[PDB]
Design a binder for this molecule. Structure first.
Ligand SMILES: *[C@]1(C(=O)O)O[C@@H]([C@H](O)[C@H](O)CO)[C@H](NC(C)=O)[C@@H](O)[C@H]1F
Length: 354
């Protein structure tokens, strides 16, 4: 198990249970926001952490409910944070589902903050406008969970990774497909992008130039991940394939995380996911140095031993040793906690320089 700069439980089972991590880096602020579901999916909680590089440490402030990120009589789940670098606005997207839980009753929601997460606007229900008629051909959908993406296209578009359970045939159960919600006017209007392929679930997206490419990395029902690419900013994921090197454990997979960061030499991808093909154990990191080539995915390196599940990655700028710094949040010990991990490219992939 890799040398890391920090390893700290930031949420743990107590009065409540914590699952579904999301992580947001705020560059100008040397700060991180760690989100999770608080469950009896009830509510969403937040912890802010200040990153002090000379001490190689993030200090986490107190846990707080994001009071506004809720609908009456609904449970809130699947936090997807995004920072709009053009507007200084913080977005938190999420799913609202009736308390009493065939017919779609799932709601799409956003709250915003302009004081870096300290306070929040009241929720906007994006459901009808964002989805339209399709709403009726699904039994449910989700967003994320985890960080979303803002492109460096002209409009600085927002990309919110998602999936839908489609009612495609009357005899078959609903079938899941990944897709993205897109906005070009900074989250005032939303469009639903086209689906990727049958039997994909929780996904995340990253941008790479090498000419703009949205890469999407999706959970599968199969033994490997599904990776897909858009050249039109996430409207169509034209190519799609299984990635045998990125394994998926029994019943039906695990959520994992993908980010891009600057090439030490334009971008490389980092991906986290459990690495036992047999179970949700042994959080590994994988590097794609010639992205998005599926065959360029590396062997995993080991970040955490034992029982690990969902994760969320953030690029945090330059690490004290000069190489890309990464922060990571994942579910651990049979969901008894969510661990924050911070480490650098030099620490994890010493052989691909620093
Ligand atoms: C994960 C999990 O596998 O552990 O799965 C999600 C869904 O059950 C999965 O995508 C299959 O439908 C859960 N999401 C929601 C919206 O409930 C996660 O909470 C988690 F359970």
């Amino acid at each position: 198990s890799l040398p890391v700069l920090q390893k700290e439980s930031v949420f743990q089972s107590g009065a409540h249970a914590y699952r579904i991590p999301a992580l947001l880096y705020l560059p100008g602020q040397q700060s991180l926001l760690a989100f999770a579901e608080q469950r009896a999916a009830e509510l969403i909680v937040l912890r802010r952490g200040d990153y002090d590089a000379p001490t190689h440490q993030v200090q986490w402030q107190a846990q707080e409910v994001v009071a506004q990120a809720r609908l009456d009589g609904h449970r809130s789940m699947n936090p997807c944070p995004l920072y709009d670098a053009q507007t200084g606005t913080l977005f938190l997207f999420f799913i609202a589902i009736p308390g009493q839980v065939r017919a779609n009753v799932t709601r799409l929601c956003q709250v915003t903050s302009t004081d870096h997460g300290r306070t929040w606007s009241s929720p906007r229900d994006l459901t009808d406008a964002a989805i339209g008629p399709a709403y009726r051909e699904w039994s449910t959908f989700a967003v994320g969970p985890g960080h979303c993406l803002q492109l460096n296209d002209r409009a600085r578009s927002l990309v919110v990774p998602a999936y839908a359970y489609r009612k495609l045939h009357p005899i078959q159960r609903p079938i899941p497909s990944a897709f993205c919600f897109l906005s070009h006017d900074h989250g005032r209007t939303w469009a639903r992008g086209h689906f990727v392929a049958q039997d994909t679930l929780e996904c995340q997206v990253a941008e790479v130039e090498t000419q703009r490419v949205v890469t999407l990395n999706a959970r599968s029902h199969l033994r490997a991940r599904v990776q897909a690419q858009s050249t039109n900013d996430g409207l169509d994921f034209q190519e799609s394939q299984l990635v045998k090197k990125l394994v998926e454990p029994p019943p039906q997979g695990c959520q994992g995380s993908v980010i891009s960061f600057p090439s030490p030499r334009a971008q490389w991808l980092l991906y986290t996911h459990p690495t036992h093909s047999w179970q949700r154990a042994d959080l590994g990191a994988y590097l794609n140095p010639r992205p998005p080539a599926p065959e360029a995915w590396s062997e995993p390196v080991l970040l955490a031993k034992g029982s690990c599940a969902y994760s969320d990655l953030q690029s945090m700028g330059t690490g004290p040793d000069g190489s890309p710094l990464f922060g990571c949040l994942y579910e651990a010990n049979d969901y008894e906690e969510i661990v924050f991990l911070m480490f650098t490219l030099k620490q994890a992939f010493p052989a691909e320089y620093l």
